[PDB]
Subunit: 498 residues, 3 copies
């Protein structure tokens, strides 16, 4: 007997088995890692049904589909049967789901080009809990790009990728969202990827959120790149863990108004020669809470390793960074010569007591020039404020008006209030204001042994005692000169000639 | 032959199939977008088994159940057959799962009332990877509310919503958690929703986390509201992407002790007439890292557009905001007349060089009054500190005690230490302290041409030279007056009469 | 007729059913909560196929497996049949998925030891949407540990746990990652757990991300512990919701360079006697945005309750914390006496106007000593800066050199620039510099009634009028003394002897 000739609940048993019951794999697929399953799999993927490909290793060549709804139940492995070229390509899927499956490459060489999964255009596709294995050569594990509309509303979550054949600057990465909008990329763990790291945003990518990204032994962990006039802008990148990258945790790129937040990077076992926290080339980006450690001046191979927690590249401008250089290597900030209006808050200085004691702590210090183009560095724990983009520091107790034409650009420090305003200095055993100039000349108004003293020279003073004003030494200091004489004066008893 | 008359593994094949085997849709369901599938689907959802509704479009009217365990395998669509009213209503589910499915509405008009999915009470329900389509009128895509115990332990994640028929203030949103506790809302992408935006927390909602929310062209992206005396409090809202909202990225509401963190908002393509970053009406809230851009004084239609990155509404008090007004429009902060004790840190000033040069930068500046009720604004990159809630600025190098009965409210600036304490001013070519008053009177203690000068008038001075104290001009300045004469003095040689 | 004698598409119907057709539970499993299903379930889990255990309660004793691929479809409950010992133990799974299922304990006593689910070694295992029920005694709901290699690449997400039999310090928790690397723990809701709370990282745990954790009525919510010489380090912990813990929201532990961010804690209904925000014992950790409320000096039972938003334990050093003590209890920061170089920014002071008015606000205040080991506390809204690790506060308008051998350690306040540098004080009715010392002696340089006055005693002064310098009173003050006389002087008219 055959199923076509049997009834179940009054209907064809064949049809029930073929169309209604859920199966572990498509009928006719072997899943034995050797039989060519391409045709059966391609047919299933091009249907409008949910496809299950599980409980086996399915050898299959390149496949194009207009539909993406595939689940591996955590046991399906799609193993690329070809040693070159792209594997799975989804063309402009309108909604879709690719989930709970492993995609394995079998590239011929370490320079073989090919993407593992491509969303060639797409809207509202969710790729979730996918493991990319045996990743090699040039290309990406998961890439979304315009075809020709921007990818929109993607959710890429729970992605693992494992790369091999690392080389500096090699053109590969784990996840690439090229020019996507309104998309989420969350919970990614990428190992040993080169130039484009764990997550790359590219081109006109905007209004995406990238979150919870771990990159281990990658060149960069997150990377913002472009081949066009506009770079990734208006993206949120939050929660980046950089386990021993080779160059930087985060490359913020040439774009603008990105918010990057909570970046932890360790270099303790890395072969990096030029270790970076975050770099930025564009404008008006926020880089909040970069915690970097494990840079002691030497890398894992005994080579010199420089440290830079934040680098402002080229004309980078109007950016903000808050940083924690929790390491002993000298380098902390690099302001390239053309960079302007960047503000860095060193929220904890590590073991440093002064960010200016070494000229190498802040490379590019000449760009801190007190003009409207100034870069600025603060280290509040050290009470250290270096530069102001207003050309001054000013405090006021309350909103108030100032008298016209009194304060000038010379008034670089302003302590303002209404009513009585007193600046109190002291609390100890002696208290003073020291006025001084670049030539080393110094003069004080001091409270010394309980009297005011006013400096008359490098060593001399007038002392305002309770009963008399006196010079520091006798018979040497005059009141007036022949060229600058008093009009006169008033004394109850004539001055005593000593 | 029939399956009742065939054996499989020790029982009839009929019973094996009927009792054990999983299917793509319930028996009797058409999934053809036209047949009324309400009866079969209602029966399934009212069972205690895990229900699968996939590979079709299932036309169905309103359904109620006390059980919620439904999976659509990414291919099932529940298509509301009625033109009005609520669709799916789950009454007090004790645990539940709604996953991998699309819920489509089919409302008669753009003002038709109806919720798509209601959790009318519930505990430990997970709603994940659900797409809400053709959303219109008033109501919500997904709403949880007390029935009448608080919803508790919900996990709502991976939600898409697409609204049409936007109108200002229309009473609709994507996800609403009314009075829930201990719940997670994560990874939401909502398009074109009106008043209640992508995620609303409402009423006594507390102890929830809302994370990774993208709202595109919504009126507001996240919204905290209430129809009672108590508003959402003690919630964490983190990672908000506001792609061109029409009024505000985040409405923090009238509640208290919410922590809102990492908010990116762009207005570059918005028709908003009044663009806002975050608004807050309540107390003791924290609003961290609001990055706002795309406001140059006009909207997408060429109409005037105001900007306000943080707005403190009504009696809003004791709030904190850290903000990045990366835009050229003049408005930045609004303190409404009853607002008190709000502290704003402008972490990067955009292109501004002075927060006080435009009277528009801080609207409500009179509320910065230096009292215990003062609002306060700092812009550290500009070295600019506006207001203090203590009525003073005070520094100390270490913990110390001060002598009783010395400092008073006049001492609005205090630079304190033990032992020797010196305030050094200068490092250039001239250095001074300028004392001045509101009437324009200015007097200096300066280091000028290498000597101390003490101002005796607007233009006059005493010069403390190394060998003599001299007046600025000869024969015009006296030592003593008829009514205030010295007691006497001591001079080695009698004064010379010139 | 048996299915072995029937054909479906040219293959045995028996084999097609048994191998390819999915079922709700393993053949032979009762799922009736009473029948011992151990044998059948153990066999299934030890196969290399994806296992489905759903639509029932499956009574089962302890099981060991080398494979982990199990899905409960939201309706399966694994109910531990034994009253002691471990339940499910997965031994070094290489990849794995445990999902959509409930695991229930049935321990004999409130001190019975046992783990619910153990990953005894493991790589690339994902545990998702699991509910742990009836959790009791000592041990954990989900534990991962080395066997013998660190767990690597775990994804633990969407976890609920409910503990019963809470007691202070009892050795139990929800999720424990012991010595894992490169792992993600996201979206956890844990109720009533004791010592180890919702999520513990332990031992050499490094390069993990923990996010979106809700703990209700737990002793601690997140906990970093160790039984060895090295403690959890280089981890990111972000988004912690502490709904009324009994001791602390976050225990940061003895390790280093962890970044903890966005912690919301409420004590309003807690019986805690000692309420804490975050504690830390190690070094170079960052604790960002701790918002704490609900501490008024008493607990929920009316007993005394202390408050500490940040506690620096033992030799804790070089840590940073930004905090919001939004409560009325007096305690805010505790620096234990051996703690050094910790910097706290109180970003909003709540209702406090002065962090020093109560000695209880900063416990351990002697550790703010102005040395290179100093702790430091800032409260910017109050304009209050307490301590500096450099021993000074210094501002400069731009990068510049200083001539050496001019400024010394006494110059504890430095206001620097090039060219003309003026410190302007005033804007009101009178303006002054008050120099003062610890004995209460005070002297001023003031602008008073439009003239400079220089104090000569507690009450006396010299007044620099436009036409004459005069003493405050007549016939009492001398110019010079017998031992300190002028050289001479120059006057156009002889001084008038009155
Ligand atoms: Br680039
Ligand atoms: Br270096
Ligand atoms: Br180091
Ligand atoms: Br140093
Ligand atoms: Br004032
Ligand atoms: Br049989
Ligand atoms: Br409201
Ligand atoms: Br603009
Ligand atoms: Br001192
Ligand atoms: Br000057
Ligand atoms: Br410990
Ligand atoms: Br200058």
């Amino acid at each position: 007997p055959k199923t076509e000739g049997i009834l179940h609940k009054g209907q064809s048993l064949y049809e029930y088995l073929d169309a209604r019951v859920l199966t572990s794999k498509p009928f006719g697929a072997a899943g034995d890692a050797t039989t060519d399953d391409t045709e059966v799999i391609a047919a299933s993927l091009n249907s409008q049904k949910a496809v299950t490909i599980s409980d086996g290793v399915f050898s299959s060549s390149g496949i194009n589909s207009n539909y993406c709804n595939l689940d591996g139940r955590g046991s399906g492995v799609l193993s690329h049967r070809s040693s070159t070229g792209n594997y799975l390509v989804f063309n402009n899927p309108r909604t879709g789901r690719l989930s709970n499956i492993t995609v394995e490459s079998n590239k011929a060489t370490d320079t073989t080009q090919g993407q593992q999964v491509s969303l060639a255009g797409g809207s509202d596709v969710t790729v979730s809990d996918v493991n990319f294995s045996n990743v090699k050569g040039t290309g990406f594990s998961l890439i979304a790009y315009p075809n020709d509309a921007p990818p929109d509303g993607l959710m890429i979550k729970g992605i693992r990728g494992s790369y091999s054949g690392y080389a500096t600057n090699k053109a590969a990465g784990c996840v690439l969202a090229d020019s996507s909008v309104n998309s989420l990329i969350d919970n990614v763990i990428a190992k040993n990827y080169p130039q484009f790291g764990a997550v790359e945003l590219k081109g006109t990518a905007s209004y995406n959120i990238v979150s919870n990204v771990i990159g281990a032994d990658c060149q960069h962990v997150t990377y913002n790149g472009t081949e066009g006039p506009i770079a990734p802008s208006n993206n949120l990148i939050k929660g980046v863990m950089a386990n021993n990258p080779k160059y930087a945790a985060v490359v913020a790129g040439k774009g603008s108004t990105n918010l990057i937040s909570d970046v932890l990077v360790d270099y303790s076992t890395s072969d990096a020669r030029q270790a970076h926290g975050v770099t930025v080339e564009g404008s008006d980006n926020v880089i909040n809470n970069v915690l970097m450690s494990g840079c002691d001046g030497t890398n894992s191979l005994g080579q010199r390793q420089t440290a830079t927690i934040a680098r402002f590249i080229g004309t980078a401008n109007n950016n903000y960074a808050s940083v924690f250089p929790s390491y002993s290597a000298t380098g902390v900030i690099t302001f390239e010569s053309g960079s302007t209006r960047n503000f860095v808050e060193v929220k904890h200085p590590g073991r440093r007591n002064d960010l200016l004691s070494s000229a190498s702590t802040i490379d590019g210090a000449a760009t801190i020039d007190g003009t409207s183009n100034s870069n600025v560095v603060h280290a509040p724990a050290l009470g250290q404020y270096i530069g102001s983009m207003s050309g001054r520091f000013e405090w006021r107790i309350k909103s108030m008006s100032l008298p016209s034409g009194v304060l000038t650009s010379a008034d670089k420090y302003r302590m303002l209030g209404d009513g009585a305003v007193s600046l109190a200095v002291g609390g100890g055993t002696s208290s003073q204001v020291r006025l001084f100039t670049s030539d080393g000349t110094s003069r004080t108004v001091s409270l010394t042994n309980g009297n005011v003293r006013l400096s008359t020279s490098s060593t001399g003073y007038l002392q305002l005692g309770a009963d008399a004003m006196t010079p520091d030494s006798t018979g040497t200091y005059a009141l007036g000169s022949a060229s600058r004489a008093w009009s006169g004066g008033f004394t109850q008893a004539a001055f005593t000639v000593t």
